[PDB]
């Protein structure tokens, strides 16, 4: 077995310890969007209508 | 106390024996070095895993 802590060198847990540090996973995963956003909008209005019909 | 120089620039069996056994001594020492540096050589081993 391995004891309170293991015996001095530590024993061995830079590997095991190391190549841990997880599991890992690693989990590529769940991530977050700031999305993006669209820009509006083109005029100036012009008359005919609706000066005439007002 | 002379028949002591005598003998220790003589020997045979006594002696023989004793150079057989200083040799052995000498051969556990040095198996015994080549049993310690392994250990050095792979608690090293185990600092170099730890760090992958």
Not at chain 2, 13 to 36: C, D, E
């Amino acid at each position: 077995c391995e004891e309170p802590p293991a015996p001095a060198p530590p024993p061995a847990k830079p590997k095991a310890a190391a190549a841990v540090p997880v599991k890992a996973a690693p989990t590529e995963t769940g991530a977050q969007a700031a999305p993006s956003y669209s820009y509006v909008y083109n005029p100036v209005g012009k008359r005919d209508p609706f000066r005439s019909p007002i | 106390m002379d028949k002591y120089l005598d003998q220790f620039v003589k020997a045979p069996p006594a002696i023989k024996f004793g150079g057989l056994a200083f040799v052995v001594g000498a051969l556990t020492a040095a198996n015994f070095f080549m049993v310690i540096q392994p250990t050095e050589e792979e608690i090293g081993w185990a600092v170099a895993e730890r760090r992958k």
